Amino acid sequence: EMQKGGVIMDVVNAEQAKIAEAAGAVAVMALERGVARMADPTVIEEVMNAVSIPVMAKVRIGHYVEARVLEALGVDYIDESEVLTPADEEFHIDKRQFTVPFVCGCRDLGEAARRIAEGASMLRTKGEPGTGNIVEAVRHMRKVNAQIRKVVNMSEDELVAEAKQLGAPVEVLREIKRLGRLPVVNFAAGGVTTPADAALMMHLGADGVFVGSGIFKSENPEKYARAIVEATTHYEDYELIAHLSKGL
Amino acid sequence: TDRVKRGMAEMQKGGVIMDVVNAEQAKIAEAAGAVAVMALERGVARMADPTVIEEVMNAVSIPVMAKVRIGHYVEARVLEALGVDYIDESEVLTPADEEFHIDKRQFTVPFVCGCRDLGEAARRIAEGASMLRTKGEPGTGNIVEAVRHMRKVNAQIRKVVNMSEDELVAEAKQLGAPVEVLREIKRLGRLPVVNFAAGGVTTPADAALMMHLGADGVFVGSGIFKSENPEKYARAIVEATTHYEDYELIAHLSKGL
Amino acid sequence: TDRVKRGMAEMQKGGVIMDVVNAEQAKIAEAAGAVAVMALERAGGVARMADPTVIEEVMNAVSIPVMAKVRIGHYVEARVLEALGVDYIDESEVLTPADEEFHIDKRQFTVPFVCGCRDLGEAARRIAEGASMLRTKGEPGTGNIVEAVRHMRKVNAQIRKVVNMSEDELVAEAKQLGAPVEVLREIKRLGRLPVVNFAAGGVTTPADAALMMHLGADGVFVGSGIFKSENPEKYARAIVEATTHYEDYELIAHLSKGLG
Amino acid sequence: MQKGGVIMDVVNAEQAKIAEAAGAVAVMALERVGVARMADPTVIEEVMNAVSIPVMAXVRIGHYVEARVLEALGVDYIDESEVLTPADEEFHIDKRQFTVPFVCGCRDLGEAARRIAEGASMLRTKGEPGTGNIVEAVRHMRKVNAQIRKVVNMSEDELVAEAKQLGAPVEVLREIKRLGRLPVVNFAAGGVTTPADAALMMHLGADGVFVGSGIFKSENPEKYARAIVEATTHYEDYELIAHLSKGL
Amino acid sequence: QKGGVIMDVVNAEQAKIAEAAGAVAVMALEGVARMADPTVIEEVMNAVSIPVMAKVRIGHYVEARVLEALGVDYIDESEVLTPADEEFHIDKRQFTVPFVCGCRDLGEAARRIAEGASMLRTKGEPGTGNIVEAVRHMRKVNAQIRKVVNMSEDELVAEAKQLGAPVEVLREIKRLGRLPVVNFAAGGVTTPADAALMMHLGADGVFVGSGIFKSENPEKYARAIVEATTHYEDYELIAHLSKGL
Ligand SMILES: O=C[C@H](O)[C@H](O)[C@H](O)COP(=O)(O)O
């Protein structure tokens, strides 16, 4: 199900992976680092052997075989990722055909619903990567959740037209209206840097957060990772978050 | 419940549905071999006076259709209460709602809806339509309207049926269609509901042409009853639609008119 | 005070308000079960407040509330109607606007106003000007219900959005709609508009009237078309019953049989 | 000067007497309502001899000699009027060179100020004529008065720039700021048809109203003229105005 | 507190100088620009008795809650930091601590007030040393206020629509004859003449940046700004105060 309230961390090796696990990450995202492709299987296996929590890796958008390779390696989740160099500009992977669950990116409810119709088991609401700027995450989490609230409360007979306007599959919108939320977990990602950032994303209705390699470029990675984990879990404990922000 | 509604529509294959304004015309249509009649009254065009619809219902044993203005939920509920067999949410009447069609899933009676392309068809189906009418502009006597859209809809269906499974979500986005309807279409090799041609079907050759182009049947308008011999004319359309590849018969049937 | 004007406006839900040009029509409207009447005088030309004589004729003919129209922005026409003892003033877009930019400051009046709106921004601006009741309406005189439907769908969709939206997003929503934020805050608090909102524009058949109620209207306005029918009292009656019993489709079906 | 008053269009002595009897503060002598020019002097003299109240007459915009002719006839006011066919598209009459006072039209404060700089002694704020539609008068009275209120209260050092933006002479703006209003009387005109219309213009800050020949096409001109006069004078007496509206 | 000067400070030493020079408050400060390290803010809070401001990125609700928890006296939802939300500002009504917000015109000012702002900073572009930024916007805001104060009551709803303002805030402005909160100028206030100019243009006070502490004699410079802002019509004094720097 992917533990709601959790933090998923990018790691490039076993050492980083262990630190992430020790800090309380719910999962790790194995990475290698022009054209950006699926990581060398060796690196992924190194990370898989280093920890007991779920390991994700990831593939280029549309790269069906990269995904099958990761599936064969025994990865726990595949991330069909926009930060890698897209392999297909028009068609995403038909994730319904896979055993392993996929996480996909989205910027609005239309994208989210299309990813779900392709078989996505989890979503990452994200704008531009690598900026350290939370505005990317915020813009899109606000958009997606505002659009969800609209759908949840709208007149049933207006959903087909709403679907057309969003570019969404209507059955996904119908499911959203029925549940009062997305039928999959939706984590924030994009520039989540400080403990306050992580808690903010939770305040805005995220189910959890992804954080990048910035953690391991700090002076004390384990303390930093830890602060993000605690802030994300205790996202309304402002005294704690204030205290956690001091070190960094 | 969708299956029963669709099954009712399905049993109409090869058939002709005729517009009638009174009991006399309705009886002629039934006598000529129509599979159903469409009751009409004739500025703003609305649901017909219930009296006229009841007159038609009492005059024949075949199914009676009537319908309502697009989006007019209450007109539809009225026709449902009258015991009509099919409701036609019709673009020739003056639309009551420019943006939202009736949520036809909430009804007991089955609906026929219009469409000009596969995106429209799929949206109508998602709203609960049990039958489709592929049609362009009405009242012209010009078959090009029907042809353009039957060619489009069927060409788009053939594309979907044979396309790579992983390309359907993007296809759906491009068409403005619900992907689950496209998936159903690919599974069945056709639309999951009956699809009749309508728009300018005038001659027996016209009716047979629409069947040649893959229609499941045809709608014909009041033009029939403005001819010198309506029963013969209606008859010719019925036989041409049924025996749409019997060109000697169609040639013979065309002589009278 | 607004609170009392609003309490007066409340006494109209589920009702039909009818246009009448004389005492005879007014009595028929009352007899058919109208909750109020709208007194009117009547091509191309300037349309103004009706002759006070005509309004008094209607006021004397019935016991139900009497409304009359003024031109948009025509402060003095409104004061005149107030002085005549009219029950409601309708600042009406079907009359020839007197002011293209500024509506009447209705807060300064004793008598309650009804105003038109096409979307929630307009509705909220009319409310901030002191409107006690709204009429959601597109183009008039067409017999085409699409006008009413378009705008009732828009207004109610926008209300549902506001009711459920995150509290901290309202100021930006207000900016985007051109609405006063305090009205949006009130809407979110109540779960609906703080005033009654009737449909108007092409309501012709009983099915039309019931449709508007299905779409969330609090009632309907109907025009002079009623009195051009063969049996006005039966027709008016059918609209009244359809509006009240808007989910009774057997009754509505039966009521639709008569009309020409 | 003649505040609260009504000025009435008249085509002959009979109409002029009725206007005087109804309480008009002045009359405007006309020939009619092709090319529209100064009226035949005979018609103007007929009206001048028929009443003791001031008599006005129209000249074409820029028609210096028409104006001199009316001056020589002993007219009390000259109306350099946009409803006549303009003689000069670019330059209005230099009214400073005349003994007789002029009334001029205006649609905004810039125009008003330019007319004043040319020597206008009175203004008529008016849009399109002959419509019976008060919106013309209202639009422009609202504009002129809103612009005046802005000038009256604005920072002194911003006036030169305001003048540039309006196309106004700054000394007129300075005078307006000093007086808190226009230095001349400003009457409304354009579609004033009902007693409510007349009172509305006063509510909007007019100093008075002009009314056209419509009065004499009614069934009872003297009663109608009378109603306009009383409504304009007692513009906040809504019971009276209501009563006055009953007849016609 | 009106007539005052608020000064940017990066440490306890600067904060003490600002307090000694007569600042009414200090603004504690420390690519992407975020809320300052709490340690730096606490250092400044402990160093002085006057109010301390700090901050947060626009829309960053949690940064604001953090500063609230630290015991900061005012939160500055600041456009010079990297915005966290391009569309929605913080709902400041939900907070105990008061906020200052930026504005460039009356529409913005009124929207900030409706969100719960307790103070305004009328400001254009930062870091230029050019007073035109402050002037443009103080002139705009105050011209728009004067218009609203004197305009016909029945025209306010339409004015509000045109400005993008909440009408109830305009109604309040008309009632008071001014903004219902204090409005300080900021943006390129560099010389004593600049500071006094902003007061001449109707500011309630001024913000000044770190430029003060890059001068040869910060305490004298800060002092000159403070005195010029207080005695903004004393041109002999202002002339004298301008000689040093
Ligand atoms: O035959 C199509 C009709 O013109 C409809 O009014 C409309 O164009 C289809 O609506 P939509 O494609 O938005 O569902």
Ligand SMILES: O=C[C@H](O)[C@H](O)[C@H](O)COP(=O)(O)O
């Ligand atoms: O029903 C709308 C009226 O015609 C108004 O006069 C106008 O179109 C919109 O109102 P506002 O003045 O608030 O934009």
Ligand SMILES: O=C[C@H](O)[C@H](O)[C@H](O)COP(=O)(O)O
């Ligand atoms: O640079 C800061 C800007 O002034 C704000 O981001 C801007 O005011 C956005 O808010 P609003 O849309 O309410 O003006």
Ligand SMILES: C[As](C)(=O)[O-]
């Ligand atoms: C916007 As897409 C074609 O990635 O669903």
Ligand SMILES: C[As](C)(=O)[O-]
């Ligand atoms: C525009 As002009 C000739 O009336 O000053």
